[PDB]
Amino acid sequence: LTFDEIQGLTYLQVKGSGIANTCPVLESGTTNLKELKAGSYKLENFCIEPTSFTVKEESQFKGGETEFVKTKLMTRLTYTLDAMSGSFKVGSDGSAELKEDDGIDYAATTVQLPGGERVAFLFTIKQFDGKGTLDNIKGDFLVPSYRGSSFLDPKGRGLKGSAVFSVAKVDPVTGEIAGVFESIQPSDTDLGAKPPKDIKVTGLWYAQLK
Amino acid sequence: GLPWYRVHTVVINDPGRLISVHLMHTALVSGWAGSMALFEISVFDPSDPV
Ligand code: CLA
Numbered sequence: 001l002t003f004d005e006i007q008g009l010t011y012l013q014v015k016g017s018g019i020a021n022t023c024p025v026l027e028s029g030t031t032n033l034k035e036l037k038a039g040s041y042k043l044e045n046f047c048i049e050p051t052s053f054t055v056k057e058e059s060q061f062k063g064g065e066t067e068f069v070k071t072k073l074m075t076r077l078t079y080t081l082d083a084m085s086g087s088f089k090v091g092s093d094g095s096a097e098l099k100e101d102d103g104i105d106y107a108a109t110t111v112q113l114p115g116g117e118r119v120a121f122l123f124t125i126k127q128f129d130g131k132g133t134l135d136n137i138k139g140d141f142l143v144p145s146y147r148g149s150s151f152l153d154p155k156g157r158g159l160k161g162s163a164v165f166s167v168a169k170v171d172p173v174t175g176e177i178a179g180v181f182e183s184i185q186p187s188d189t190d191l192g193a194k195p196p197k198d199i200k201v202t203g204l205w206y207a208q209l210k
Numbered sequence: 211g212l213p214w215y216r217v218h219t220v221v222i223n224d225p226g227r228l229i230s231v232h233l234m235h236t237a238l239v240s241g242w243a244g245s246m247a248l249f250e251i252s253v254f255d256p257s258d259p260v
Pocket residue numbers: 214215216217218219
């Protein structure tokens with residue numbers, strides 16, 4: 001659905017189907033790169049869908065080269081970071097300077113490997129600054145802490161990743177911008193007891209300029 | 211009074227019971243097959259086939 005097509009629904013209609021775990025699908029707005037004016041804009045509802053979680057399996061079966069492996073989600077429909085905001089400049093030729101400060105910027109999910117091994121990991125885009133021109137909007141984010149410092153271990157004792165945006169469709173009137181998204185972040189470690197694992201996440205995103 | 215080494219000679223002339231012990235033998239062989247398969251899975255290591 002689109003944004004108004006989602007907000008026309010009531011909560012009794014959203015509740016129980018999985019429509020809430022989606023970015024609103026953007027209409028035909030392709031290749032409008034000259035239809036971009038400047039300003040120190042902000043975003044209204046900066047939402048990001050993931051669609052595939054792959055894990056770098058460090059175990060060898062071919063040689064000294066390891067790829068990324070498609071896996072299964074484990075918890076339930078517990079993704080699509082919502083309501084993110086900040087300060088979002090559009091420059092002269094298409095230089096976006098996108099700064100994230102607020103909103104639900106984290107979601108903790110678990111994922112197997114084929115072999116029967118569970119790995120928990122955060123999905124965090126906390127405090128991201130992407131300053132690029134509409135193809136590789138690069139920059140780094142924070143992976144703050146998988147669990148708090150006040151966590152009890154079971155017997156009562158006791159970083160930065162890569163993220164690349166893209167822009168595909170542009171609404172010229174209202175500023176609704178879609179695009180594709182990739183990221184690579186480390187897994188959870190239990191404080192050095194287990195070495196981390198690289199995890200790639202691919203997906204789409206959506207934003208509304210203001 | 212039969213000796214111990216000819217106790218299965220009571221089913222020379224009882225063919226339904228002959229089929230019964232054919233079936234019991236087949237069940238025991240299949241039971242070994244399943245148990246040895248599960249034990250060999252539980253011991254087996256697929257970590258590096260090279
Ligand atoms: C296809 C296999 C087969 C089958 C169906 C039979 C069938 C028979 N044999 Mg026989 N036999 C066989 C192979 C076979 N034999 C072989 C290979 C030998 C040579 C070693 C013999 C030597 C032999 C003698 C000398 C006699 C028979 C007799 C008999 C008859 C009665 C059996 C009885 O009550 O003994 C009951 C015997 C026992 C309860 C002892 C079992 C204890 C064994 C040794 C240990 C357990 C084995 C273990 C489970 C591993 C086996 C599994 C696998 C490797 C085979 C019966 C018709 C008797 C006969 O002619 O009737 C008068 C008799 O006197 N057999």
